[PDB]
């Protein structure tokens, strides 16, 4: 009785939301952008190949200066690379060999890692002794950590398999805020350019936009058919691209509050592991399970180019802050730079 | 320039040399050791086997290092994780074997059927096609008592038990009842028909009947891991 009427009320709220969205879709993005010139053909070439990892590499995150990167591999190793000279700067071993995510602090004074150990380990790179040792450990989560990004030196947001996200305090050690509402595992998250709002994409085929202070979900975005594996904002922060296992990327507008265009092709039947935008947002780079990466026109939904320099599945793909080059890391323990 | 750039480059090269030297020994140790992942249900008896391994020699993963005849082994137990395992099971594609322990006597409603796709999904998973799985059918003693009593029947939960016969290559233990002998071999074939359906000769299954108090479980893993990386080497030589 009570549960049934709550379900009916939720259903008619959803109906009202869908009707409101339909009353807003006056014209599609394709019709508006049919009158601009195409980007032509882009041919990205491989410059640097980084070698030295034993096992498969999952994650990398470019620095603020677009010069250094960090790579995490199941040999228990976080290798901090310098991309310009292909020289290894740091190599941090772990207590637990299984790592799934990594992050690089905007100030460059810290790095983060986590995984099946349920512990977010924050490593300090500016130790007085000169050796890098574990600086902070956070163990409040009850699920595997899938992604973690820094807000500043003293705060971190972590997405775990407990269907909840958490904003911590490194100095304090306790969870400052918890974000609940996702029904599945939160696989990836992306921060806004003004670090004021952030989206979390889960295995419930949905993404949610959260406010850092308020700690409440502002808007929920659906439309995907499978598990959302990667998510990234547009440079302006008013839209974002989501990639899922259904071999489709989708662009959602925050102000419009529904999808704008879907990037998909009939020749792709493999999942999407990593999505990232260019500096101007005109091109969308998506890494796929077929050992291949595709660069799409963000305004034409046309496959602009193909990058096929990997042997195993592409696990991480990132565009620098300056957008000069794109780094792709795959399971064959190789990191590559394209430009 | 060489005023300061040369010194920085030299220092960075020396550092990279030091990390390469350390990673050489780290890689030697890593290749020396073999990584095993332990999976099972909540009542599959994996804790008993872990304790038996540990006595001879909330955290989200427990690491057990033991040596059998001067060979390193890493044994990972997954805990404090949700039952949704379609995401983190991809982390174990490079393990030499997945020690799968299934409570045989636990046939909610049906642990054995639920345990079947936990093996089937692993077998047909895209990223686990190159990982061998060792099947351990625990609680052999408890299985025998239930069959001898006759209270519970396999045919109630598996309709194909009626027409199945005892394998001609079977080697029953002395003093074992003929009835329990046929039943305990039927469970193996349930995992075996799934085992040889796909893969096209890239990973195989190594069933073994073990008791929770058997001290020779190290030898079974010793011989299986001796053979898992012995068939893989034989596939590169096209001798198989």
């Amino acid at each position, epitope marked *: 009785s009570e549960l049934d009427q709550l379900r009916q009320e939720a259903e008619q709220l959803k109906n009202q939301i869908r009707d409101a969205r339909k009353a807003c879709a006056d014209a599609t993005l394709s019709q508006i952008t049919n009158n601009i010139d195409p980007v032509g053909r882009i041919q990205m070439r491989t410059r640097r190949t980084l070698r030295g990892h034993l096992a498969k590499i999952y994650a990398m995150h470019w620095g603020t200066d677009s010069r250094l990167l960090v790579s995490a591999s199941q040999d228990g190793k976080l290798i901090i690379w310098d991309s310009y000279t292909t020289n290894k700067v740091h190599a941090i071993p772990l207590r637990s060999s299984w790592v799934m995510t990594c992050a690089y602090a905007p100030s460059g004074n810290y790095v983060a890692c986590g995984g099946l150990d349920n512990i977010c380990s924050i490593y300090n790179l500016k130790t007085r002794e000169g050796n890098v040792r574990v600086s902070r450990e956070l163990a409040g989560h009850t699920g595997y950590l899938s992604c973690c990004r820094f807000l500043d030196d003293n705060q971190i947001v972590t997405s775990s398999g407990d269907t909840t996200c958490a904003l911590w305090d490194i100095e304090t050690g306790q969870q400052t805020t918890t974000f609940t509402g996702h029904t599945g595992d939160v696989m990836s998250l992306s921060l806004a350019p003004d670090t004021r709002l952030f989206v979390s994409g889960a295995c419930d085929a949905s993404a949610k936009l959260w406010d850092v202070r308020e700690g409440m979900c502002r808007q929920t975005f659906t*439309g995907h058919e499978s598990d959302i594996n990667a998510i990234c904002f547009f440079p302006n922060g008013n839209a974002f691209a989501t990639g899922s296992d259904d071999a489709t990327c989708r662009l959602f507008d925050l102000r419009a509050d529904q999808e704008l265009m879907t990037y998909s092709h009939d020749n792709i*039947i493999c999942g999407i592991t990593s999505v990232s935008f260019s500096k101007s947002g005109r091109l969308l780079l998506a890494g796929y399970d077929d050992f291949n990466c595709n660069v799409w026109d963000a305004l034409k939904a046309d496959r602009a180019g193909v990058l096929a320099g990997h042997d195993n599945r592409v696990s991480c793909l990132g565009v620098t802050d300056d957008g000069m080059a794109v780094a792709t890391g795959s399971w064959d323990s190789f990191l590559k730079i394209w430009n | 320039k060489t005023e300061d750039q040369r010194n920085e480059e030299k220092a960075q090269r020396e550092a990279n040399k030091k990390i390469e030297k350390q990673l050489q020994k780290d890689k030697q140790v890593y290749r020396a050791t073999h990584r095993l992942l332990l999976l099972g249900a909540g009542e599959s008896g994996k804790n008993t086997i872990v304790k038996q391994m540990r006595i001879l020699h909330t955290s989200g993963i427990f690491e057990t290092k033991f040596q059998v005849d001067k060979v390193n082994f890493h044994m990972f137990d997954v805990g404090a994780q949700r*039952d949704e395992r*379609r995401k983190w099971i991809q982390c174990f594609n490079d393990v030499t074997a997945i020690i799968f322990v299934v409570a045989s006597s636990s046939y909610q*409603t049906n642990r054995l059927q639920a345990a079947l796709k936990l093996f089937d999904s692993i077998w*047909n998973n895209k990223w686990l096609r190159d990982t061998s799985v060792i099947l351990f059918l625990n609680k052999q003693d408890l299985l025998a008592e239930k069959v001898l009593a006759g209270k519970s029947k396999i045919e*109630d939960y598996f309709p194909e038990f009626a027409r199945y016969t005892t394998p001609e290559d079977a080697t029953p233990e002395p003093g074992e009842d003929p009835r329990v002998t046929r039943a305990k071999y039927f469970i193996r074939d349930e995992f075996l028909r799934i085992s040889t359906a796909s893969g096209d000769g890239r990973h195989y299954c190594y069933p073994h009947f073990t008791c929770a108090v058997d001290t020779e479980n190290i030898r079974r893993v010793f011989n299986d891991c001796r053979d898992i990386i012995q068939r893989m080497h034989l596939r590169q030589y096209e001798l198989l």
Partner: nanobody
Amino acid sequence: QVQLQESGGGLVQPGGSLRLSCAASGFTFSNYKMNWVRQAPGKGLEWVSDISQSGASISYTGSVKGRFTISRDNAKNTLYLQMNSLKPEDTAVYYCARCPAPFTRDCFDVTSTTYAYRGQGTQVTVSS
């Protein structure tokens, strides 16, 4: 929005027959293989049946093999489960589930307690 709605449940006398229907919207139904699961009162989730993308691969559990018939219609995006000769042990809440990824032979976490890709389910009660 991906939504799966089930219908056809209710109370059935022993030995009866029922037809559970699952209507799925928000995705390409022809690219996924589908499952029927059940939950006994006071017990955990137990898988019942599964059907492949084109209907070639159909498998049944031990308790319902030969008594259940699963089918799918890609034209209307509908999934049908015909239950024959119902017994009191079949009294459960039945759910229509979909595999997490398309074009995948494996199907993980369909018996998980907090699975997102399942409908609210329907009650099927066998009583005298």
